[PDB]
């Protein structure tokens, strides 16, 4: 039933095997950053390789705790007073964004017995200066604002500064963390290097990551955590769509039953061009098509692709790398029904996980 | 994100 | 309870009064285009001024029919075979995007007795940004003249176009003239014409007289019922998003972390992008304190904007974003697991009613 | 686009 997401356990496992290699070679721990991928039908499988989850807030923390188990970590730029009590029940590690936040909740944290951390902003930009180390970032504590006199009760330090990056910028950022915050690392029980590590992308320098993690754990006597999101589900899911109509207007136009605006919003927002199985670039194959959504939106154009044979009503189009940053942020704009969610099991069978309908659209509006 | 998709 | 949307009936009514003026002065009909605003707690009020709704698909058609009543129109670039029967049971006017679509469903339409139309692409661009313009080359929306099939119009009772966005009357008048030049020989036989949305009818300064004159002339010349289907105009400047400041910090300037997220709760702010109005907020350097306002998400880029205020923002300060009824609740999300803002209705008598409050289950049920 | 005319 199209449109539908399909997540493939064998492809998830290919990624998880690499992450488990890093765990086994270093003694570090690795958590799923749920903001990238929260498909909890897969949490038990993921939890059989990884150590738990991290969360952006109460809802992700509850989902990780209840559907995966293991360790449940959380970070937020600012916690809500009306949620901190439940957060401290669910989570075993809780990361604060500022000294004001830490001091506000310190008494409750100590009474809960859970492990408190602080997020650091090392001000070492390795992206495009969306970069958490860009000037004016609200994420993490800069050295100039760091309060060593207020570290009683802090057991960990955390940073997250990367996105789809290799080991070298991590190694470089760790060196800056040591230069700036070095005197306060020894007293911690754990350090968390964040996400953005493209660990499962072919060619990633696993050896450099292993060496860096091991050196830090040894030098400071800490447990290191990594919290990748994208790497867990990279190239492990698809979005399957059926062509509904084909028309001619200064070229071939295909109306699909999936919408970029509703079902893969980053395609339009970023923007980026998703891979299509059997699809090429314009002029690469025999037929060029502009693929558009079934919405009333002039701008809901998925992209221009070529195919060796015609697309016609009933043709199936398979978008790739559709597990990450997709289902976690899709919407019902224009009243489009949400795509169904399927799981392709490692034995090859396919299970319907979730099918949506009118009530899912209606209940958001009043 | 979305920089490394493959068929 | 913040963050929360608040829609104000008095401000909705200010807009609806203008739309009703147009109806009363012309005898046209006006429908709510639900894609902009689908807050069905307000549909009875809206339906007391307007003639019904139009829809982008089955779900909007069902919502309009069940929650407003009146007339229920629909247009889609391509209908699903598994939905056409229910669509025909709900809708009284059904607009097809192509002759292939019309011919595919013609037999069912005739059996249903509902009124069929076609969307035209007059290929007359008047919008600034071509990416959003349904008349831009290669558009998938509507039938261009070179593709028009006069021999296949048996059973067609209406013609439709939608080509504007936040525009005054003059671009509509100009587009109507193009429609007459290109499709004129086929207008007389229609029962209705639909001029679409994008008419900024409720924006102060809109040339209502020019709209009235154009609608009246077309209705008279061709003996048709004209429909307008604004979305934004119905709810323009009729809602707010109220947020509380959670933390304030300093990093090359003052930063306030709010309990609302642009990425989750007003995504057009980041995507367009655009700068939403804040009550009491000015531009950078205009008032005494400059702040960068950011969301409570783990997203470096979830920055609402830079604003100035006469007094400091502190934890507990309330910030009120304006013009938040349109293209907001209809497309928001639970990225990062942020809870959806509550929805309140400020009634004509000044009382405030909680319409809908969300929680964990609304986030979880979307994921498996 | 769709947010040109907001007012306090
Ligand atoms: K230690
Ligand atoms: K007529």
Author numbering:
A (entry chain A): 9 to 137, 140 to 376
B (entry chain D): 2 to 8
C (entry chain B): 9 to 376
D (entry chain C): 1 to 8
Paper text:
The polyamine known as spermidine is typically made by spermidine synthase, but in many bacterial species, including 70% of human gut microbes, carboxyspermidine decarboxylase (CASDC) performs the terminal step in the production of spermidine. CASDC is a homodimer, with each monomer composed of two domains: a β/α-barrel pyridoxal 5′-phosphate-binding domain that forms most of the active site and a β-barrel domain that extends the dimeric interface and contributes to the active site of the opposing monomer.
Electron density corresponding to PLP was observed in the active site of both monomers of ClCASDC. His170 forms a π-stacking interaction with the pyridoxamine ring and Glu237 forms a hydrogen bond to the pyridoxamine nitrogen. The explanation for this seemingly unfavourable position may lie with the Cys306 backbone carbonyl, which appears to shift ∼1.4 Å between the two conformations. This shift alters the ability of the carbonyl oxygen to donate electrons to the pyridoxamine oxygen and Schiff-base nitrogen, which may be important to facilitate the expected proton transfer during the catalytic cycle.
